[PDB]
Amino acid sequence: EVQVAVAANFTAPIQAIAKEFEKDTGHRLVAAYGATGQFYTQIKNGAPFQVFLSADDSTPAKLEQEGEVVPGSRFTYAIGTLALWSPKAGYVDAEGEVLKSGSFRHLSIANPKTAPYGLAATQAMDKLGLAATLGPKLVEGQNISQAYQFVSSGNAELGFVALSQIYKDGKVATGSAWIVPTELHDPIRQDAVILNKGKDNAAAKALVDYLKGAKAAALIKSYGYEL
């Protein structure tokens, strides 16, 4: 009986971790998907969420500075990666030269004010020196999922997506990708946290002990995350 707030980049991963979770603990994971900032606002307004799996480390810590976090519950459950991606296999090269020289008019990022992966996109465009040239071409999704769908659907020619959305057991499994090297943005450290309303919930404690387990660790590394 555990309400879980899940940043959009971890939509697929948690649905999968929850099948084995239910079968192993008897507790059912009911999760909501969206942007980290949106969940921040909802949690501050009394949303019933009990566990918050963030796409950052900063916002769970911010909720702890604001008294919404069980102290001692904050841990890192996943480290993500940003990838320039397009379903079209010809378009996005393996050094990502298209950012510098492409002919594309639409570039999908996540709302960088609410979506950690969107902030990583803006950071990498900053340190690449392509902020002024790429800014006008940007288009924002409410969350990283919507930014990926803008490309998948055809409303943009490429976008900065979460590696979890294009990654196999080892490999990018679809389209054309450029692994954004980590030197260009802050590492995408994703912190989990138990909220005020999970202080003595057994489904919450069971879930965060299982997110540190072996079944969940093997699934989180199947999606391209590191630990």
Residues at the interface with ligand MOO (CB under 6 A) = 7-9, 35-36, 55, 110, 115-118, 143-144
Nearer Cβ to ligand NH4, position 166 or 219? 166
According to the binding rule CB under 6 A, does residue 171 interact with ligand NH4?
no
Query: CB of residue 89 vs ligand NH4: minimum separation in angstroms?
Result: 7
Q: Considering Cα of 223, then 226, then 32, then 151, what sign does the dihedral take?
A: negative
Full strand arrangement of the beta sheet holding 51-53 = 29-34, 2-7, 51-53, 188-194, 75-80
Query: CB of residue 103 vs ligand MOO: minimum separation in angstroms?
Result: 27
Query: CB of residue 180 vs ligand MOO: minimum separation in angstroms?
Result: 14
Q: For ligand NH4, which residue of 19, 44, 88, 105 counts as binding (CB under 6 A)? A: 88
Q: For ligand NH4, which residue of 67, 71, 90, 136 counts as binding (CB under 6 A)? A: 90
According to the binding rule CB under 6 A, does residue 168 interact with ligand NH4?
no
| Amino acid found at 222 | S
CA distance 9 to 76: 15
